[PDB]
Design a protein around this ligand. Structure first.
Ligand SMILES: *[C@@H](O)[C@H](CC(=O)O)NC(=O)[C@@H](C)n1c(=O)c(NC(=O)c2ccc(Nc3cnc4ccccc4n3)cc2)cn(C)c1=O
Ligand SMILES: *[C@@H](O)[C@H](CC(=O)O)NC(=O)[C@@H](C)n1c(=O)c(NC(=O)c2ccc(Nc3cnc4ccccc4n3)cc2)cn(C)c1=O
Lengths: 88, 180, 88, 180
């Protein structure tokens, strides 16, 4: 039989900065946010859910030294923790 | 007969630290009823999409974008996703690609997805390759959510959809001074 | 001396539904989202951070039985866990 | 000489379950470096604001709104906040109240804040009491963030600002059918 489902659910968006503000990119090292996100997923995917990893990425941007940017999580409808279980 | 000081980064997971069987079982035993279920490693067909614009008709080249494509592709493969990489698209092309992505049969035998967008951006959204102040070429984040929601992507119903966006959201430095 | 600070940081917004969609309110029992949020803060403020409590509220809305609504967290720039430590 | 089956709900925290000293110390010992600091209970001056519109000039009364004011006021007091309650405001009045709230000296000796908005709403934002399709009276969520950010509310720099919104975000039921 037919059943109703939420039209929008289980999403998370993570942007490189807050609204109105820039993000930084280096010609040979790439985007600061991307490099920071990769480092955090590599270290923390084993033990933290994605929302926690994203918070840790935001925390690493806290002390602004010349190229300020504050990554922001948006339109979050995850109802569960998303653990990546790398290796499984 | 391995050496803990010599970390293995040579497997499919590369530089991503592995979740031990003991840690995986510990993570579950804490809050099992509130974790997204993961499918069998041997049969799941996880997909991820990367859309990245480096070359534009009317705005400057995003030098270093290839370094971002490399890093995100390898990371997503390390996490178990098969990655499609699409480059230098207009907002219309991005919509067509996202719609094609939502139509992929692999999502039915997948437990999750990642979408990564990397381009120039303004407050309104992400720049397509033809963007100019005169004739805008913008993909809004609202359109991304709509194309991947339970209605437009039924294969991903109840599955986490992680969207990563690398793009300016305006022209401000995002700072204020305070007395230290 | 002067020091730069992120213009927008340490926020979290929690809305009663997803964009484009309605939320429900009863004439004598009040708003469904408000009642659900109060119940969850009462039970979980002692042991869960606010982002976790909000996820638990979203999870309680999952099986839609006639008045569907999916509360959404928005524009998140919390860099740390916000524990309320009720009683302290 | 208390009975665990008879829970004390008679203190300032009412029906909010208490965080034991042992649990509080356990929470800290797990991730202290990543928790928002809380100020001394004896001297902190936490504030919270509730803005709620029940009576409108051109749209229907939000019957049950008083029940929401009661519940949220008591909850916020239970959590240690002094609560201001402002009712039946236009979007202009809400802006004036929010600006006044950001100017409160108590935030300097507070560790956090909660803002709660409860009104009719549309996709664009929250309805002020004078809202009509003809002449809109809307407060956008972007304006709320701007008025409370590090620049406009320096007293709340590095402190969590929790915003709760009860308001429709459009006219859709937010559902799709699927074959069960
Ligand atoms: C907005 O869309 C773009 C970013 C994008 O195209 O995605 N922003 C700009 O183009 C804008 C703000 N911008 C820059 O970003 C410039 N960047 C620099 O000046 C610059 C960036 C980064 C570094 N250093 C650095 C160090 N370690 C790193 C490690 C990993 C990854 C990156 C790292 N970057 C130094 C300088 C410059 N201009 C002119 C500019 O307009
Ligand atoms: C959008 O802004 C508003 C909500 C608001 O004013 O904040 N939405 C509407 O006015 C709209 C969708 N709407 C309703 O909400 C109606 N509600 C009902 O039909 C209805 C609501 C809730 C219940 N049941 C219930 C049960 N237990 C509860 C416990 C706690 C709190 C609330 C509870 N509610 C039953 C019916 C009706 N109409 C016509 C309408 O337009």
């Amino acid at each position: 039989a037919i059943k109703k489902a939420h039209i929008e659910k289980d999403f998370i968006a993570f942007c490189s900065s807050t609204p109105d503000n820039v993000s930084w990119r280096h010609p040979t090292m790439g985007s600061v946010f991307i490099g920071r996100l990769i480092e955090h997923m590599q270290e923390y995917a084993c033990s933290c859910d994605v929302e926690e990893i994203f918070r840790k990425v935001r925390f690493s941007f806290e002390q602004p030294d010349g190229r300020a940017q504050m990554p922001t999580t948006e339109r979050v409808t995850l109802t569960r923790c998303f653990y990546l279980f790398p290796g499984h | 007969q391995d050496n803990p000081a010599m970390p293995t980064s040579s497997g499919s997971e590369g530089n991503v630290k592995l979740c031990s069987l003991e840690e995986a079982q510990r993570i579950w035993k804490q809050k099992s009823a509130e974790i997204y279920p993961i499918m069998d490693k041997s049969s799941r067909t996880r997909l991820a999409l990367i859309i990245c614009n480096e070359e534009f008709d009317s705005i400057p080249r995003r030098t270093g974008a290839e370094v971002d494509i490399t890093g995100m592709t390898m990371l997503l493969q390390n996490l178990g996703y098969s990655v499609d990489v699409k480059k230098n698209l207009t907002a219309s092309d991005m919509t067509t690609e996202l719609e094609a992505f939502a139509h992929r049969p692999e999502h039915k035998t997948s437990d999750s997805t990642f979408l990564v967008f990397m381009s120039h951006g303004i407050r309104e959204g992400i720049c397509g390759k033809k963007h100019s102040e005169q004739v805008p070429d913008i993909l809004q984040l609202n359109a991304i959510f709509n194309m991947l929601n339970t209605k437009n992507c039924p294969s991903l119903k109840d599955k986490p959809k992680v969207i990563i966006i690398q793009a300016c959201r305006g022209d401000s430095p995002g700072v204020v001074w305070f007395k230290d």
